[PDB]
Design an enzyme around this catalytic site. Structure first.
Site, PDB file in Angstrom:
ATOM      1  N   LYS A 190      73.521 -11.837   4.730  1.00  0.00           N
ATOM      2  CA  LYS A 190      72.792 -10.959   3.833  1.00  0.00           C
ATOM      3  C   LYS A 190      73.725  -9.869   3.317  1.00  0.00           C
ATOM      4  CE  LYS A 190      68.134 -12.153   5.143  1.00  0.00           C
ATOM      5  NZ  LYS A 190      67.178 -12.279   6.279  1.00  0.00           N
ATOM      6  N   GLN A 229      64.596  -7.666   9.652  1.00  0.00           N
ATOM      7  CA  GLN A 229      64.928  -9.036  10.011  1.00  0.00           C
ATOM      8  C   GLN A 229      63.887  -9.562  10.979  1.00  0.00           C
ATOM      9  OE1 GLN A 229      67.545 -11.110   8.758  1.00  0.00           O
ATOM     10  NE2 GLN A 229      65.969 -12.463   9.635  1.00  0.00           N
ATOM     11  N   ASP A 251      61.141  -8.125   0.788  1.00  0.00           N
ATOM     12  CA  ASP A 251      60.692  -9.360   1.429  1.00  0.00           C
ATOM     13  C   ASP A 251      59.266  -9.772   1.011  1.00  0.00           C
ATOM     14  OD1 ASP A 251      62.837 -10.401   2.803  1.00  0.00           O
ATOM     15  OD2 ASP A 251      62.411  -9.281   4.639  1.00  0.00           O
TER      16      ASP A 251
END
Ligand SMILES: NC(=O)c1ccc[n+]([C@@H]2O[C@H](COP(=O)([O-])OP(=O)(O)OC[C@H]3O[C@@H](n4cnc5c(N)ncnc54)[C@H](O)[C@@H]3O)[C@@H](O)[C@H]2O)c1
Ligand SMILES: NC(=O)c1ccc[n+]([C@@H]2O[C@H](COP(=O)([O-])OP(=O)(O)OC[C@H]3O[C@@H](n4cnc5c(N)ncnc54)[C@H](O)[C@@H]3O)[C@@H](O)[C@H]2O)c1
Lengths: 282, 284
Positions: free
Chosen positions: A52, A96, A119
């Site tokens: 990422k 995460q 997200d």
């Protein structure tokens, strides 16, 4: 014949575009910035995270990586988000997944300010999507799948689609995006009596289960479109999907490789979202 | 094969209203007077009748109702301001806008303007999000919620079942499908663009129909012992109201089926009431 859904190539084209965008924002004071929050030292999660950050630098996005303890408390996790929430230099905030069990996953994802929710896991952004709106942030995996399919001008209206796996990260928003695209959708999962019954009649199958060789030659029709979201590590250390790629690819009009299919697309969507948020500051 | 069983929404809703009645008597004594606001824009005859019946069910079970009957041509702003007042009024526990709204008004904007803790129809984006995430704590849309209660009341196991939802709207189809999927059912969602409905229906243990199309579900589309829930409401020329299912033939193959009228209808109403009292009750 047969054609590879090559997210690798496709994502590269996107990163190029974001390189350019950030230069412009960066000149006008806005330095695109993603805050990633990693809890505990799970080397797989550590994998996704390294990548990422590496992706961010590749295309002029400032990464902030908070690698904090596996045991840190809900309030500490929360206070960091609060700070990031109000930090005008931060444009996206991502936790995460997954988190330690002692922490309430939903409270945490809900506590990210929805306008930095890259997200797309904040309830209001999930809501927007399930309503057919593009008024928010869409989850990166399902989004990457759609962008990919749209790159190959694969028409979706009316298709018979099957999503295998019903998670909030992939399956559910995947289904909603297909349905927003006019597809007929069936959502299958661990409790589905006979998966083959849905899979044999399917024009399009999205596999997102976490089970090696879950989808086999005898479950799919000739000319099926297969999107393999799964990521599994064998003894080999070799990373494979949920689909038996050897036998299933022979029968597919289009099919994602693993790796190099959905994976790079997921990362590219995380980048687009971070920059979309930055763009808004103007 | 066993006697077909009517999914009797009328009897169940009457049982529920009775429960709600007692809950309210209790809440009055704690100084909580459950109260629901209903907003009706324009003079649609169907809308109007839906409103009357909502108000009447409220009075029945000890819920105070406020009906705002606004001009077909009122401004998006005027409506927004009203909702704002109602959002802030601590004596109002539920706010509902009667659909459909006129073409000149942004529906999504209106529904999202309702404070999510009074969103008894469950159409606020955050409430739609909670559902999709699998949380069934918050406010759930009344129609699909009523289907679930009705199925639960008849002790229908849903885990592992093959369920088909015909229709994909925000009011019914999509939340219906999410709730069945939340209950461990495999779901298929079909709609006007589906190539072939029988592909899905012939195999189904459970069919929820919600399309607004007379005789969409015929006897040759279903398997023996199927459970058929009919959400549709259509008026034939004869003034009779039927659902979307060919009830006469389809009920002959059904282990369980909702009649129309008297199945889903009274349950949708009972759920609006339940959600309203849920909001009131939260004040403790
Ligand atoms: N990094 C990426 O590009 C990306 C991101 C998302 C997830 N993934 C991978 O894809 C998979 C999906 O992630 P997830 O969060 O959705 O996982 P999950 O375990 O939370 O959800 C799995 C879903 O698949 C279903 N399932 C599991 N086994 C099944 C079986 N044998 N038959 C039918 N259904 C079955 C489950 O019921 C469940 O609904 C995982 O392996 C994950 O590693 C990849
Ligand atoms: N009992 C109640 O108080 C109540 C409450 C909600 C809605 N309803 C009824 O349920 C029905 C649908 O409601 P809605 O708000 O979802 O309407 P809608 O028009 O918004 O949605 C219709 C859905 O069904 C699909 N559809 C329409 N015709 C179809 C066909 N021939 N084949 C397959 N799919 C088809 C559409 O594509 C769409 O997805 C209507 O009859 C409505 O009156 C009942």
């Amino acid at each position: 014949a047969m054609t590879l859904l090559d997210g690798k190539a496709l994502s590269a084209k996107i990163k190029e575009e974001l390189k350019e965008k950030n230069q412009f924002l960066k000149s006008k004071g806005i330095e695109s910035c993603l805050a990633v929050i990693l809890v505990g030292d799970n080397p797989a999660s550590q994998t996704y995270v390294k990548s990422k950050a590496k992706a961010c630098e590749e295309c002029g996005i400032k990464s902030l990586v908070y690698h904090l303890n596996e045991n840190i408390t809900q309030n500490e996790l929360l206070a960091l988000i609060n700070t990031l929430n109000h930090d005008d230099s931060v444009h996206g905030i991502l936790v995460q997944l997954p988190l330690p069990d002692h922490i309430c996953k939903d409270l945490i994802l809900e506590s990210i300010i929805s306008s930095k929710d890259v997200d797309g896991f904040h309830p209001i952004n999930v809501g927007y999507l399930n309503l057919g709106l593009e008024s928010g942030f869409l989850p990166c995996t399902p989004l990457g799948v759609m962008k990919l399919l749209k790159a190959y001008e694969i028409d979706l209206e009316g298709k018979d689609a099957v999503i295998i796996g019903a998670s909030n990260i992939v399956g559910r928003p995947m289904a909603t995006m297909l349905l927003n695209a006019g597809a007929t959708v069936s959502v299958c999962h661990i409790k589905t009596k006979d998966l083959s019954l849905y899979t044999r009649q399917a024009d399009l199958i999205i596999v997102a289960a976490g089970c090696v060789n879950l989808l086999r030659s005898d479950m799919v029709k000739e000319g099926v479109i297969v999107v393999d979201v799964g990521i599994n590590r064998l003894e080999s250390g070799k990373i494979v999907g949920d689909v038996d790629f050897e036998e299933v690819s022979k029968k597919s009009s289009y099919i994602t490789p693993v790796p190099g299919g959905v994976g790079p697309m997921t990362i590219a969507m995380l980048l687009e979202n971070t920059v979309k948020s930055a763009k808004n500051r103007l």
